[PDB]
């Protein structure tokens, strides 16, 4: 039904449409791996959209930020840092937050700091450190869509409707 170009623009619509303070959306895509020796399903960054809401740390941060702008000032917050750092992460299927979602076709809704730090998932604990309080992973056939917010958000039926209209499902 859907495809990679349509991938990003739908993540946009989901974050904008919802009446909740969602900070970003990410789509983790499937890949296959071998070694010299089996076939492993891999989750990786297919795309993402950020909406939003120490001078050692900050000068370091703006410096990569200016380094990616030349490739193709302001202050850069924790949520923004977490969003772009996430582009380098990958998840073996059934491992971590996005992997566990995909193996069992599961939607994991983590609401509250305690739910994040008690989830046993690395990515959930890392998101909490950068101020996230809600993190969601909804397993699609196309992949896994991840939502995250600095606010505490309960699972809305209106949101699960929008997610279902913007991604592939078996």
């Amino acid at each position: 039904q859907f495809n990679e170009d349509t991938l990003q623009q739908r993540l946009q619509a989901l974050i904008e449409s919802a009446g909740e303070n969602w900070t970003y959306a990410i789509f983790w895509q499937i890949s296959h791996d071998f070694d010299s020796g089996d076939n492993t399903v891999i989750l990786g960054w297919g795309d993402g959209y950020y909406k939003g809401e120490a001078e050692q740390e900050h000068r370091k941060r703006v410096i990569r930020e200016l380094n990616s702008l030349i490739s193709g000032d302001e202050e850069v917050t924790d949520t923004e840092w977490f969003f772009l750092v996430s582009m380098t992460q990958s998840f073996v299927n059934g491992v971590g937050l996005p992997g566990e979602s995909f193996l069992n076709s599961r939607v994991i809704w983590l609401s509250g700091s305690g739910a994040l730090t008690g989830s046993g998932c690395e990515r959930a604990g890392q998101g909490q450190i950068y101020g996230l309080k809600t993190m969601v992973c909804i397993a699609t056939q196309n992949g896994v869509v991840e939502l995250g917010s600095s606010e505490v958000i309960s699972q809305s039926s209106d949101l699960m409707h929008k997610v279902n209209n913007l991604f592939n499902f078996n």
Binding site: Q29, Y50, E74, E80, T88
Partner: peptide
């Protein structure tokens, strides 16, 4: 604002971009 548009710039290409 400014940083947000750059994030979405890198995001839409980060699939092909291997070294971020």
């Amino acid at each position: 604002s400014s940083t947000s548009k750059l994030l979405n710039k890198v995001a839409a290409r980060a699939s092909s971009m291997g070294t971020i």
